[PDB]
Amino acid sequence: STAGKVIKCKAAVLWEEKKPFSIEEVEVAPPKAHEVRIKMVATGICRSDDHVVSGTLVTPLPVIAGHEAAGIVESIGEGVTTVRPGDKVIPLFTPQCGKCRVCKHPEGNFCLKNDLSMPRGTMQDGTSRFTCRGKPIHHFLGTSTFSQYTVVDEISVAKIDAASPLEKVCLIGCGFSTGYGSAVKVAKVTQGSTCAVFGLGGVGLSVIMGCKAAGAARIIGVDINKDKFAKAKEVGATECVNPQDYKKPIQEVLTEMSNGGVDFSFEVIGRLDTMVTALSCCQEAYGVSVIVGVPPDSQNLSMNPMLLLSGRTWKGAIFGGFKSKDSVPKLVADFMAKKFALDPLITHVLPFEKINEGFDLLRSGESIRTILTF
Amino acid sequence: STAGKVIKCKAAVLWEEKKPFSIEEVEVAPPKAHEVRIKMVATGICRSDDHVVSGTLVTPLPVIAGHEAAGIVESIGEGVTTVRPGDKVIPLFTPQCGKCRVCKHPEGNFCLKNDLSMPRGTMQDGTSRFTCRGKPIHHFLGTSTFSQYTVVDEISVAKIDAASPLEKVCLIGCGFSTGYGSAVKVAKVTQGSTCAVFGLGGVGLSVIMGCKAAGAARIIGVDINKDKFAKAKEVGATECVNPQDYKKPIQEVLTEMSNGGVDFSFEVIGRLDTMVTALSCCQEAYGVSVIVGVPPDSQNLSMNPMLLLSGRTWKGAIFGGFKSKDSVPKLVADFMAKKFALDPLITHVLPFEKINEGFDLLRSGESIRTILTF
Numbered sequence: 243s244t245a246g247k248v249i250k251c252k253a254a255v256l257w258e259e260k261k262p263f264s265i266e267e268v269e270v271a272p273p274k275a276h277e278v279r280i281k282m283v284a285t286g287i288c289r290s291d292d293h294v295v296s297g298t299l300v301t302p303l304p305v306i307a308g309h310e311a312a313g314i315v316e317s318i319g320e321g322v323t324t325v326r327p328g329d330k331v332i333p334l335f336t337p338q339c340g341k342c343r344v345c346k347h348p349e350g351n352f353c354l355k356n357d358l359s360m361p362r363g364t365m366q367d368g369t370s371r372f373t374c375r376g377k378p379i380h381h382f383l384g385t386s387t388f389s390q391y392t393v394v395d396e397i398s399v400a401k402i403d404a405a406s407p408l409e410k411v412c413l414i415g416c417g418f419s420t421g422y423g424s425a426v427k428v429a430k431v432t433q434g435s436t437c438a439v440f441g442l443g444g445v446g447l448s449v450i451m452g453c454k455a456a457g458a459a460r461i462i463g464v465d466i467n468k469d470k471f472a473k474a475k476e477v478g479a480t481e482c483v484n485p486q487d488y489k490k491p492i493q494e495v496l497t498e499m500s501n502g503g504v505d506f507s508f509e510v511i512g513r514l515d516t517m518v519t520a521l522s523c524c525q526e527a528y529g530v531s532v533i534v535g536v537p538p539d540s541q542n543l544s545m546n547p548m549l550l551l552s553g554r555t556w557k558g559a560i561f562g563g564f565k566s567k568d569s570v571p572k573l574v575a576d577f578m579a580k581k582f583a584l585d586p587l588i589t590h591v592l593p594f595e596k597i598n599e600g601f602d603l604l605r606s607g608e609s610i611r612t613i614l615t616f
Numbered sequence: 617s618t619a620g621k622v623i624k625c626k627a628a629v630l631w632e633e634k635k636p637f638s639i640e641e642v643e644v645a646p647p648k649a650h651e652v653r654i655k656m657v658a659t660g661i662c663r664s665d666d667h668v669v670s671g672t673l674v675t676p677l678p679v680i681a682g683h684e685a686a687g688i689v690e691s692i693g694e695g696v697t698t699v700r701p702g703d704k705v706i707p708l709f710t711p712q713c714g715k716c717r718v719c720k721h722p723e724g725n726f727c728l729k730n731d732l733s734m735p736r737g738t739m740q741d742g743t744s745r746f747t748c749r750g751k752p753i754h755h756f757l758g759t760s761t762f763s764q765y766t767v768v769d770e771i772s773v774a775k776i777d778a779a780s781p782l783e784k785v786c787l788i789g790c791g792f793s794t795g796y797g798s799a800v801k802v803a804k805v806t807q808g809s810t811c812a813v814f815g816l817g818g819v820g821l822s823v824i825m826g827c828k829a830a831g832a833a834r835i836i837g838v839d840i841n842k843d844k845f846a847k848a849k850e851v852g853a854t855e856c857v858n859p860q861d862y863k864k865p866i867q868e869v870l871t872e873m874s875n876g877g878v879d880f881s882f883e884v885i886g887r888l889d890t891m892v893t894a895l896s897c898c899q900e901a902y903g904v905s906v907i908v909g910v911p912p913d914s915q916n917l918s919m920n921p922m923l924l925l926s927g928r929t930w931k932g933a934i935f936g937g938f939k940s941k942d943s944v945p946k947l948v949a950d951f952m953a954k955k956f957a958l959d960p961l962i963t964h965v966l967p968f969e970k971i972n973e974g975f976d977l978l979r980s981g982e983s984i985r986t987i988l989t990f
């Protein structure tokens with residue numbers, strides 16, 4: 243038994259930007275009141291974890307990154323009521339405290355307890371559960387899933403089906419739910435509509451799944467890597483375009499293709515210029531454009547407000563608009579009943595020890611999701 | 617008798633930017649097929665008319681401006697079926713052709729036959745019905761209401777109640793409908809919400825009327841001219857703030873006052889900086905901001921897309937989102953049935969000959985709407 247004791251285990255520590263992860267021993271403290279210690283089973287490699295390495299997404303270093311994962315509860319702190327030792331669980335990078343104005347709002351999901359807007363890299367109490375080489379190490383979004391064991395606040399974990407396959411449902415912790423919800427919840431795509439999806443990685447493929455589920459007649463995938471097109475078509479794209487093949491800006495191309503602009507567009511990359519292009523390719527009077535990609539830290543975009551004055555709607559969202567703790571168990575149940583597929587997103591499987599190879603695969607263009615197993 | 621003949625009458629011509637209007641004789645051609653010639657009875661002075669004078673809003677010069685008006689049909693061209701000589705009518709600066717993809721959409725109103733996006737200053741057939749001192753003169757938004765007589769395309773006129781008071785219902789042609797619709801149709805303000813309204817002229821006052829009719833609990837008016845506050849409170853504002861009274865940026869003040877951000881905000885001025893402030897002051901996870909003011913020609917705003925990623929919605933609209941020809945007669949009928957008031961908007965009534973005095977009243981801060989009577 244390890245309950246009440248420090249655990250020594252392996253983790254992937256990031257000591258410096260623009261360097262490989264270091265796989266080495268860390269010390270993981272036992273959970274305090276209203277905290278949960280989790281044995282990790284599987285974790286996905288998402289572009290947002292890479293953004294921590296590149297300095298795109300700023301959070302304090304040194305850090306244990308990872309936010310898309312699933313595992314098994316090892317122990318619970320005083321007062322925990324919503325999970326027990328042995329339960330299967332998904333960590334929630336967006337918490338659901340249930341008590342703030344956002345949690346109480348029908349449409350709100352970006353709980354005020356989040357660590358994303360002004361990242362601190364701690365537990366809710368302002369302290370760390372991790373030591374490495376005798377030094378404190380920061381958490382990431384209250385999750386820190388690149389470790390054999392992590393500690394999370396109770397508002398940042400959801401219990402899931404005991405029969406769930408953790409090497410697949412790890413993707414419900416971020417990329418699948420984000421893209422799917424961006425289409426069906428945030429945009430509210432309509433039957434018979436025309437959609438344009440910018441970026442065909444794991445998150446953009448999940449947006450396509452949601453647009454198909456909503457009954458779109460046309461789903462136009464957009465990527466500068468034409469090797470992404472075959473899988474985009476398998477999951478529902480009706481056509482794909484590469485901006486580098488055209489002499490005109492792709493907003494003009496897409497306006498022509500859609501006979502005056504698309505109904506719904508999605509930016510699923512993280513670039514200023516494609517956020518403005520995606521806006522402008524939606525129909526000027528009634529179009530909707532959703533920003534999903536994470537922008538470069540502290541950088542502003544330039545746009546003409548006449549794009550909005552004619553009637554366009556521009557919005558963004560975290561985690562597909564889903565209230566996290568309510569939604570994750572229901573999404574897992576839907577997956578168990580075959581309402582959506584996760585296999586199309588999983589291109590590579592590696593042991594956790596080969597994390598750096600998994601990041602190489604993402605950076606080269608060759609992977610969608612690599613799943614790491616502990 | 618004038619039917620079929622050229623009419624010589626008085627108009628206010630703008631020969632070049634940054635000059636007073638010239639009140640002098642013009643010649644008005646008879647209506648061609650599918651056109652309507654109107655005897656003007658009353659026209660309002662809107663800030664958009666002033667933006668033509670200042671070069672804020674680019675349209676071809678020389679021009680007959682004016683777009684917020686009411687009059688009586690003098691004659692009709694071949695093929696007109698929707699109005700007849702003697703009818704009371706309002707000019708529609710946004711047409712409703714009924715045949716384009718925007719008119720057929722349930723939520724679109726910015727008809728593709730409009731002359732706002734790329735102004736040419738003519739009738740639909742690409743020609744002008746006006747001459748002055750032997751020179752052709754441009755039309756403005758297919759209306760040109762600063763003239764004793766104008767000619768409009770059939771898609772740019774609506775028939776209204778024969779008993780309506782034209783000196784009041786002229787405001788349904790632009791400023792009332794726009795502000796009121798921006799609240800009740802575009803934002804869809806909810807019962808119990810907190811709203812912030814930037815700019816307390818005729819259009820912003822009409823936004824306040826709409827927020828109050830929608831049941832908002834709190835309506836915060838924002839203006840640098842404190843003389844605007846008393847009337848804003850009479851029509852529904854619960855509090856007013858002047859940015860110049862505060863050491864901190866007003867987005868921070870309004871976030872504090874609303875215990876974390878407002879539900880709905882409206883930019884009703886036309887400035888890049890207040891568009892970004894208005895978006896920022898709405899709650900980051902579920903807030904909605906609507907741009908109503910007309911921006912400076914060709915200028916781009918700068919903003920951080922993280923304002924949208926957290927969950928805000930940003931939109932704009934023309935004419936309050938109302939389909940123009942369907943809506944204008946219904947709004948007149950609703951005024952006749954006492955469903956809303958127009959008198960709070962009207963501070964001055966002058967003969968048409970005093971047009972320049974009316975614009976100097978607007979520019980000095982001393983008026984809301986001046987109504988000019990022919």
Ligand SMILES: NC(=O)c1ccc[n+]([C@@H]2O[C@H](COP(=O)([O-])OP(=O)(O)OC[C@H]3O[C@@H](n4cnc5c(N)ncnc54)[C@H](O)[C@@H]3O)[C@@H](O)[C@H]2O)c1
Pocket residue numbers: 288289290293416417420440441442443444445446464465466467470485510511512513516533534535536537559560561562610925
């Ligand atoms: N809003 C949220 O809650 C949330 C959650 C998930 C991920 N993210 C963000 O979503 C984005 C996508 O994540 P992912 O894991 O799918 O990433 P990814 O890198 O696998 O996919 C991005 C795709 O964009 C393409 N691309 C790059 N530059 C392009 C350009 N100029 N034009 C067109 N295509 C271009 C790439 O070739 C790639 O296929 C990232 O920015 C990530 O940080 C946001």
Ligand SMILES: NC(=O)c1ccc[n+]([C@@H]2O[C@H](COP(=O)([O-])OP(=O)(O)OC[C@H]3O[C@@H](n4cnc5c(N)ncnc54)[C@H](O)[C@@H]3O)[C@@H](O)[C@H]2O)c1
Pocket residue numbers: 662663664667790791794814815816817818819820838839840841844859884885886887890908909910911933934935936984
């Ligand atoms: N979208 C549409 O269809 C539509 C229709 C109506 C008019 N317009 C636009 O709406 C806007 C308002 O028109 P109006 O006739 O009510 O104008 P107005 O000038 O009477 O009112 C604008 C108000 O803004 C205030 N103001 C100016 N600068 C400010 C600042 N920096 N901060 C705070 N307050 C400030 C003024 O003191 C004034 O009371 C104009 O830009 C006009 O062109 C748009």
